[PDB]
Every structure is written in C-alpha cells, then in structure tokens.
Amino acid sequence: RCKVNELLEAGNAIVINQEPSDISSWVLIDLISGELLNMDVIPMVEIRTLTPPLIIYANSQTKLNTARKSAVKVPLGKPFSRLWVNGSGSIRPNIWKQVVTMVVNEIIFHPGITLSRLQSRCREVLSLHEISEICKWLLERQVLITTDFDGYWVNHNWYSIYEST
C-alpha cells in the first residue's frame, strides 16, 4: 500500500500484465473500490486479445495515505489475565499480532457481525471479554466502524495494522 500510495501521488501509473499475487489482490481491489483510481487499457492487434495489459493512475491531487497514527494503547492488565499478556506482565507481540489479524479476518466477510456471534467462531481461543478488548482497539484505530444495532464492519485500508515482513 505504501509503494502504491507514493507512486500514484507522484503521478506515476502502474501497469499490470500478469496476475497480481493473493496479497496484491487486497490492496488493488481496495483502491479500485474507493473510486480513487482511474483505469485505462493498452490495446492489442486469439483468446489473449480479450485480456490486454491494464494501466492504473490517481484521478487528481486527491490523497491516498491515511492520517498519522495516534497512540492507541494495547489493552493490558494483571499477568496472564489475557492471552497476549505473559507472567512478567508484558505484551506478547507475536500473539497480539496473531489475535488482531484473526478477529479482522472473520469480520471482513461477515459485515455487521455482532460480539456474541463472533465469540462463537473464536471459542477455542478467546473469551467474550478479550474480544470486547480487541474490537475496542480496532475501532480506535479506525479499522472497523460500528454498524447500527452493535455490529462491526471493516473500513477501507483494513490491512494497514502493523509494519513487518
């Protein structure tokens, strides 16, 4: 997302001629779905004429990068009290990155999912209180929006949780 944002804001155009990987699929459909990207096609001249290389570019001076991150603190407490808090009373960064990813993964395909329904799908891992903690943090980071009647719905740029890999 950062590479694409910098290129498009710089007035560059991205050219696709082969299948983007499963990860580049998320970030491309997200930008396309937001109406921020214009698309044009490089024509040709067999089956291949129906699948020409595609060009993508930013529509205008409009911004693609989201606003700077605020200090949304991880929910913590007495030692061992949460799956992500160890015996020295410290955040297990691995487990926190895993549980936040897991909860967003189930809320993506189920727009509107309620806390009760969500606990049923995660019962072998998290208690209801632990999901109330994860959902509150994700709302504060704007990854989720509350639907009416207390449901959760994934916002644009939802994959932008943490830097890694």
Binding site: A10, A71, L76, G89, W96, E163
Partner: protein, 140 residues
C-alpha cells in the same frame, strides 16, 4: 478555535488530578506515571505501525530518535519517517523500475526517449547549472 479549546473542551487537563499541561505530549507522559496502571512497561511507541514498549521514558526517546528519525528525501526534500520511509520513497526516483518520461524543466515541447539524450537539451538550451537533481543524481 483557541476559546473553544481553553473554555469548553478542557483537553489539556488531567483526567484524575485535574492539573493541566502546555502540550498533549506532557499530558500523555503524566498519565503514564502519576496515574499509571500496574503495567511493567508504561511507555509505548507513538508512531505508525511500531508495536514496541519500554520501561523508562529515556528508552522511548532513544527508540524514536534511532528508528523513527524524521528525514527529508535527498533528491526531492519531501519529509519521511525512518529507514523504511526513505527506502520506500527512493523507489519513485529509481530509473530502473519507474521507466519515466523525459522533459525540460521550462520548455513545454520536449519528448526524449533516453536519459543520455535528455541531457542534450539541458546541455544546450540550459547548461550544467539548473538541471534538476533527479536527472543529475547518478548516485547508485
């Protein structure tokens, strides 16, 4: 704007002792000590996508100054944060990946096909002074 933030929206006040602070930064530090939870690491990295946490404010000051120094692009002077920020932005100038077009900084008409050929216009209608840095910078 100042009246609202100084007479109604009391955002600079402590939620507990009801002192107040001249910037949100010092209010954050105050809450992290004088009203702190039982947590071992009261300080957490304030930046984009960084998940690390610290025992003493000096270690956080060190971590921000080490891993999130605010830089300016060597070529275009636009600001960025940390080593990843610079390395991500350096792609934009890269002539190997970004097979960019070639134009004069002033003359509207130009339409070159190679980098060496573009230097002919800057070498004749201009000179080696006031050529743009991205064209000049053979830095790799």
């Amino acid at each position: 704007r100042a009246h609202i933030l100084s007479v109604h929206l009391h955002k600079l006040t402590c939620p507990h002792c009801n002192k107040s602070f001249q910037r949100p930064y010092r209010l954050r530090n105050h809450i992290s000590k004088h009203h702190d939870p039982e947590v071992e690491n009261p300080y957490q990295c304030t930046f984009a996508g960084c998940c690390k946490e610290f025992r003493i404010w000096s270690q956080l000051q060190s971590h921000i100054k080490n891993d999130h120094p605010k830089l300016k692009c060597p070529i275009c002077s636009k600001p960025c944060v940390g080593e990843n920020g610079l390395q991500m932005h350096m792609i934009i100038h890269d002539d190997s990946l970004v097979t960019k077009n070639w134009k004069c900084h002033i003359c509207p008409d130009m339409s070159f096909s190679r980098k060496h050929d573009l230097l002919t216009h800057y070498g004749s209608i201009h000179t080696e002074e006031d050529i743009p840095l991205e064209l000049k910078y053979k830095i790799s």
